[PDB]
Write a protein that binds this DNA or RNA. Structure first.
Ligand SMILES: [Mg+2]
Ligand SMILES: [Mg+2]
Ligand SMILES: [Mg+2]
Ligand SMILES: [Mg+2]
Ligand SMILES: [Mg+2]
Ligand SMILES: [Mg+2]
Ligand SMILES: [Mg+2]
Ligand SMILES: [Mg+2]
Ligand SMILES: [Mg+2]
Ligand SMILES: [Mg+2]
Ligand SMILES: [Mg+2]
Ligand SMILES: [Mg+2]
Ligand SMILES: [Mg+2]
Ligand SMILES: [Mg+2]
Ligand SMILES: [Mg+2]
Ligand SMILES: [Mg+2]
Ligand SMILES: [Mg+2]
Ligand SMILES: [Mg+2]
Ligand SMILES: [Mg+2]
Ligand SMILES: [Mg+2]
Ligand SMILES: [Mg+2]
Ligand SMILES: [Mg+2]
Ligand SMILES: [Mg+2]
Ligand SMILES: [Mg+2]
Ligand SMILES: [Mg+2]
Ligand SMILES: [Mg+2]
Ligand SMILES: [Mg+2]
Ligand SMILES: [Mg+2]
Ligand SMILES: [Mg+2]
Ligand SMILES: [Mg+2]
Ligand SMILES: [Mg+2]
Ligand SMILES: [Mg+2]
Ligand SMILES: [Mg+2]
Ligand SMILES: [Mg+2]
Ligand SMILES: [Mg+2]
Ligand SMILES: [Mg+2]
Ligand SMILES: [Mg+2]
Ligand SMILES: [Mg+2]
Ligand SMILES: [Mg+2]
Ligand SMILES: [Mg+2]
Ligand SMILES: [Mg+2]
Ligand SMILES: [Mg+2]
Ligand SMILES: [Mg+2]
Ligand SMILES: [Mg+2]
Ligand SMILES: [Mg+2]
Ligand SMILES: [Mg+2]
Ligand SMILES: [Mg+2]
Ligand SMILES: [Mg+2]
Ligand SMILES: [Mg+2]
Ligand SMILES: [Mg+2]
Ligand SMILES: [Mg+2]
Ligand SMILES: [Mg+2]
Ligand SMILES: [Mg+2]
Ligand SMILES: [Mg+2]
Ligand SMILES: [Mg+2]
Ligand SMILES: [Mg+2]
Ligand SMILES: [Mg+2]
Ligand SMILES: [Mg+2]
Ligand SMILES: [Mg+2]
Ligand SMILES: [Mg+2]
Ligand SMILES: [Mg+2]
Ligand SMILES: [Mg+2]
Ligand SMILES: [Mg+2]
Ligand SMILES: [Mg+2]
Ligand SMILES: [Mg+2]
Ligand SMILES: [Mg+2]
Ligand SMILES: [Mg+2]
Ligand SMILES: [Mg+2]
Ligand SMILES: [Mg+2]
Ligand SMILES: [Mg+2]
Ligand SMILES: [Mg+2]
Ligand SMILES: [Mg+2]
Ligand SMILES: [Mg+2]
Ligand SMILES: [Mg+2]
Ligand SMILES: [Mg+2]
Ligand SMILES: [Mg+2]
Ligand SMILES: [Mg+2]
Ligand SMILES: [Mg+2]
Ligand SMILES: [Zn+2]
Lengths: 107, 95, 60, 69
RNA sequence: GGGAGCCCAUGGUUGUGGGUGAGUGAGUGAUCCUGUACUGUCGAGAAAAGCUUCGUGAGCGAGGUGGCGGGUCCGCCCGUA
RNA sequence: GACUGUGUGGUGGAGUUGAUGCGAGUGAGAAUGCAGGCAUGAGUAGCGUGUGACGGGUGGGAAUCCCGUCCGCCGAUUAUCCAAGGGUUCCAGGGUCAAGUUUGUCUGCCCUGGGUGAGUCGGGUCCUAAGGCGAGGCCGACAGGCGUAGUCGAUGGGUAACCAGUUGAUAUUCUGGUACCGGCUUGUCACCGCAAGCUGCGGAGGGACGCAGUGAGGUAGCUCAU
RNA sequence: GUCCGAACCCACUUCAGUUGAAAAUGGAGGGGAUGAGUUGUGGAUAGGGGUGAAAGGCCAAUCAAACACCGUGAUAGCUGG
RNA sequence: AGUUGGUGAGCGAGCUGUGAUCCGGGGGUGUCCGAAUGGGGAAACCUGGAAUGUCCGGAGUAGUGUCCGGUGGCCCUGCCCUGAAUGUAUAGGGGUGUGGGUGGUAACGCGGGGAAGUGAAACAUCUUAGUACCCGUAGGAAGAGAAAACAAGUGUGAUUCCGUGAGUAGUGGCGAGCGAAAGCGGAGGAGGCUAAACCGUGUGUGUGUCAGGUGUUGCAUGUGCGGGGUUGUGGGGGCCUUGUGGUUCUGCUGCCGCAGGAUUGGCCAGUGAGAAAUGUUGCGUGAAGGUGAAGCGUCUGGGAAGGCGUACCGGAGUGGGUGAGAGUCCUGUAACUGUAAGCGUGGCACUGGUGUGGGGUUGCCCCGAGUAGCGUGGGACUCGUGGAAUUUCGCGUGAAUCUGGCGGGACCACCCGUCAAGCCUAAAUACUCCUUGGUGACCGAUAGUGGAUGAGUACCGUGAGGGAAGGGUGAAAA
């Protein structure tokens, strides 16, 4: 298994559910069952006292958003291969190939 | 040969309970030991660990409790515990 | 015995076939004879079939 | 710290001393756990992992997987 | 060592420190002990080791052991409610 | 006719209608049919030998729990301790859905924690019996059968400890007092020397043995007591 | 392989039970009770075989051939559906 | 870029990018039981090394109790010593540790043992059926296999398997039943070794052998190793006319010839069954991965994938997810790419390792023996003892050997075919405990596995063995 296209700290826009159009930061990701937590969207109670905080929603219900010309536009992602160097646990060097994400609709 | 054997591999944990604390009045300490260790080995290990003369070592085997739960009967591990009697004033600090 | 120590001749299995042809299981054992042998320099008994004994495959 | 592949920069006798010290630390941790101390519970597993690492290095040296210093 | 009621008191269904006093005589009497004794008896009532002693078909072993009273430490595993 | 509406509601929450073909695990009331659920008998029979009464307590709740006092019962056992077997039921605290032939605050039930201490007790480390297995071996088409040397196998032989005290739960085990046995080691005295000793190996002695009966000398116990 | 009679072993009569307290017992009596006695532990004999002071008795609560699995969805001119 | 498995959350950590968890590959550790293997044993337990310095090495103690590691099960087999009664000698004994074995396994294979119920409307031959079961024993397949074959007048040319022939010819208490082969059509397609003559090489022993030669020159038996040889209108050996790969230039036979010889050609041939088996270089990849296209706006709704409007991608519209029915939200899919690694694997080149015959002749020599046959008692063949070939087991008897043997359904003759009694052989065929991907006018919780959950569990039985039942809140525990 690999990771998801959405990672913690990303700024995403909600495209489905009770909070369509809401824009927030990805507070946490749960890769195993593909659910993410975005700030100030799914406010419900936990447990413990009340705890009015955010509940996870499906990762397919959010989308990475970019600011092209002053308007927020939801976009998909691609990956490009760039040459990197990785360190083996002992500390040696070797040149390897790593993927870097880019947002579409902005090249 | 690999796998150096330390006397602290035999002595696992001390038994803390009302009976153990009452036995502390007699310079007596109850330890949970490795279930394959004899009295002589436990005695030597305690001496080496604590720098303490040991007069007697008494051991018992205690059966683990069996409790019926969801998923049937569960059985807690068997334990052997050594009851070590210390010389008059030597004292062992278990914290 | 019914097994030859030379050539490993062993019993066969077939039928008693009466006049009424009510076939019954029966055995044909080889003619095994126990004779003294001197092999290389070893004196010992061996169960030897008469066929091997006639052929001379056994040293006495 | 949790020990790593720099144990390969040590010698056999001091690696064995490391084994003994780790065993003694684990002994103390187990006693603390029995007596109700030891809030730091993760060290109780990490010390055993470190012992495993030191035995790994010793056995690779003994089996000549890695040249002995 | 064990063994009753007297103590400022205790603590009031409680235990502490002192307060323990006596120890014997006779009768009776075993399925126990002497005892695998003794007597009777035919149906004629395990084995092996420990043990004592005897050598040597084996090795060890040095001129070192083996004995008798005295001192120190060691004495395992399983069961134990 | 099997059945049905392209009528109209209710419940419900994700599928499915008509035409025309195609394929069937395609139709149930019976098999003393199978599985589950539920009636009938019926609030009926039974509640497994028996002696309980009362005062107080606890509690939401008491004939059925606790304490006390009367009374009754067992006592060659309704007592006490083992073996076999069981396996945590033992103790303390919390609990009253279920289980307990009723109730239940109670429990051999549930939950949590705790509890079993041995050189001498009972087994192993020692010994063999019956019997089992069995190096080689002999026998048997194969599979296998038997058995030597051996090696296991108690229900037997051998084998060194007692009294007192203590815990909510352990006690020839812990503690106190006083012993014993085997090792190791040490002090001292005496003694050896083809010819010390030790260990193996066997010889012999011993272990070592029935049933029945009487008597004698004792002690345990019991009874009585100026 | 005496007599009377507890334990112990048995199971003659009777009553009760007979959806039992109990898939063979209970109450009252009854036979043996030093013997061909009874009992504990371990062991041996295995299905056309074992064992039987012999009843075709017993061999894990139904034995004129145990139980389990397999041949197997045996077969049934019969009964049911 | 999260992560410390699940049933089933928060602590205390590690990763805080020093890149973890995770994924592939390879190692390390691996208690005790189990073939279980030091010895014992009621599987998962117990107990050890006669006395000496202790079984050996280490740790610990004043020392013994102790600790850690190593070692030794049995059987077969190799090598060395010894050799009983006893003489040869063997058995045996003592070393050494050379190799192999033990046990497990779902189906398929081969060899052997071998029912009954059943059917025949009873039943015994027969059937069931060589089935069930059992014993031995493999391999990735096995078995078979290179004509002692078929054919019938020409011919075919190892074996296995499939379709036909054919439910035929037959067989059968001629009952119930059973049941071929040739031929033809296909799948797949190899043929190779050996024994024997004859020639080189030692021990139960010479006295006859131009350079040479001695009572022996090298003379006589029969071994173990080399060549040689392998077939059927016969072959081979022998006897000869020739031919070996160009030679440095060694002994022998005759100063002819034969053989060893050596970098070098070499037609070739190779890791195969093929009398054999040892390094470097050329391919796409499986295990992991990498890239992977293209949609918004409104409406109703708890929620849009639905409605309405309107665009896009498509080598991608197979699916499955996402709060309801998604080609463009997610996972992917198409297409392409990477594979470092593998014991990697397959194939190529190189290294490296191994190596010719044709013609004539028949005086001679060889061509697989307790075998083939024959008798007898059984079994398999369509064939159930018969007119009984062919094939097979037990017991007797017992041949020829090329002008010979065997087969062509008794047998004989001729004719045709073939050459047994030695061995090895790929492919087409059988199977799935497993691995990966995929599929279903298959099931959908009384169904489908006994088992969607603690299922071979609970539970029942002394034991072998038998053997269940229990799925669904919601979009989110809110
Ligand atoms: Mg890495
Ligand atoms: Mg990625
Ligand atoms: Mg004990
Ligand atoms: Mg557990
Ligand atoms: Mg038959
Ligand atoms: Mg003859
Ligand atoms: Mg008297
Ligand atoms: Mg006890
Ligand atoms: Mg007790
Ligand atoms: Mg239709
Ligand atoms: Mg139906
Ligand atoms: Mg119905
Ligand atoms: Mg019913
Ligand atoms: Mg009713
Ligand atoms: Mg009434
Ligand atoms: Mg009525
Ligand atoms: Mg009534
Ligand atoms: Mg009534
Ligand atoms: Mg009553
Ligand atoms: Mg009552
Ligand atoms: Mg009372
Ligand atoms: Mg009374
Ligand atoms: Mg009395
Ligand atoms: Mg117990
Ligand atoms: Mg409990
Ligand atoms: Mg219980
Ligand atoms: Mg209790
Ligand atoms: Mg009740
Ligand atoms: Mg209670
Ligand atoms: Mg209680
Ligand atoms: Mg012994
Ligand atoms: Mg015996
Ligand atoms: Mg044997
Ligand atoms: Mg012995
Ligand atoms: Mg024994
Ligand atoms: Mg008690
Ligand atoms: Mg006592
Ligand atoms: Mg004491
Ligand atoms: Mg004797
Ligand atoms: Mg005697
Ligand atoms: Mg009498
Ligand atoms: Mg009794
Ligand atoms: Mg009667
Ligand atoms: Mg009656
Ligand atoms: Mg009488
Ligand atoms: Mg038995
Ligand atoms: Mg009769
Ligand atoms: Mg019975
Ligand atoms: Mg019968
Ligand atoms: Mg059948
Ligand atoms: Mg039927
Ligand atoms: Mg009828
Ligand atoms: Mg790691
Ligand atoms: Mg073992
Ligand atoms: Mg064993
Ligand atoms: Mg071993
Ligand atoms: Mg020794
Ligand atoms: Mg094998
Ligand atoms: Mg029959
Ligand atoms: Mg019939
Ligand atoms: Mg019939
Ligand atoms: Mg083959
Ligand atoms: Mg050919
Ligand atoms: Mg063909
Ligand atoms: Mg040859
Ligand atoms: Mg995409
Ligand atoms: Mg839409
Ligand atoms: Mg031939
Ligand atoms: Mg013939
Ligand atoms: Mg015949
Ligand atoms: Mg036939
Ligand atoms: Mg014939
Ligand atoms: Mg003819
Ligand atoms: Mg073959
Ligand atoms: Mg089911
Ligand atoms: Mg349903
Ligand atoms: Mg159901
Ligand atoms: Mg059971
Ligand atoms: Zn023979």
């Amino acid at each position: 298994m690999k990771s998801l296209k959405i990672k913690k700290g990303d700024r995403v826009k909600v495209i489905a559910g009770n909070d369509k159009g809401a824009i927030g930061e990805v507070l946490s990701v749960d890769p195993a069952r593909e659910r993410v937590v975005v700030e100030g969207v799914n406010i419900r109670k936990h447990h413990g006292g009340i705890i009015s905080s955010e509940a996870p929603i499906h990762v397919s219900n959010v989308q990475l958003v970019t600011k092209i010309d002053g308007k927020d536009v939801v976009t998909r992602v691609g990956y490009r291969r760039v040459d990197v160097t990785k360190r083996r646990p002992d500390g040696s060097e070797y040149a390897a190939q790593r993927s870097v994400r880019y947002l579409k609709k902005e090249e | 040969e690999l796998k150096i054997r330390d006397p602290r591999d035999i002595i696992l944990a001390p038994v803390v309970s009302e009976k153990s604390y009452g036995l502390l009045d007699q310079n007596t300490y109850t330890f949970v030991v490795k279930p394959t260790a004899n009295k002589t080995e436990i005695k030597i290990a305690i001496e080496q660990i604590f720098g303490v003369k040991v007069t007697s070592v008494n051991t018992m085997n205690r059966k683990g409790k069996v409790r019926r739960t969801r998923t049937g009967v569960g059985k807690r591990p068997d334990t052997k515990r050594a009851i070590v009697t210390v010389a008059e004033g030597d004292r062992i600090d278990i914290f | 015995a019914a097994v030859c120590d030379i050539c490993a001749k062993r019993p066969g299995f077939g039928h008693n076939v009466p006049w009424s042809k009510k076939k019954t299981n029966r055995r044909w054992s080889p003619n095994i004879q126990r004779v003294r042998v001197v092999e290389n320099g070893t004196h010992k008994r061996m169960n030897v079939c008469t066929s091997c004994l006639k052929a001379g495959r056994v040293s006495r | 710290k949790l020990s790593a592949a720099e144990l390969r920069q040590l010698s056999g006798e001091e690696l064995r001393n490391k084994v003994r010290e780790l065993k003694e630390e684990l002994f103390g941790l187990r006693f603390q756990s029995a007596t109700g101390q030891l809030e730091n519970t993760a060290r109780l597993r990490e010390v055993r992992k470190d012992i495993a690492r030191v035995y790994t290095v010793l056995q690779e040296r003994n089996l000549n997987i890695v040249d002995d210093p």
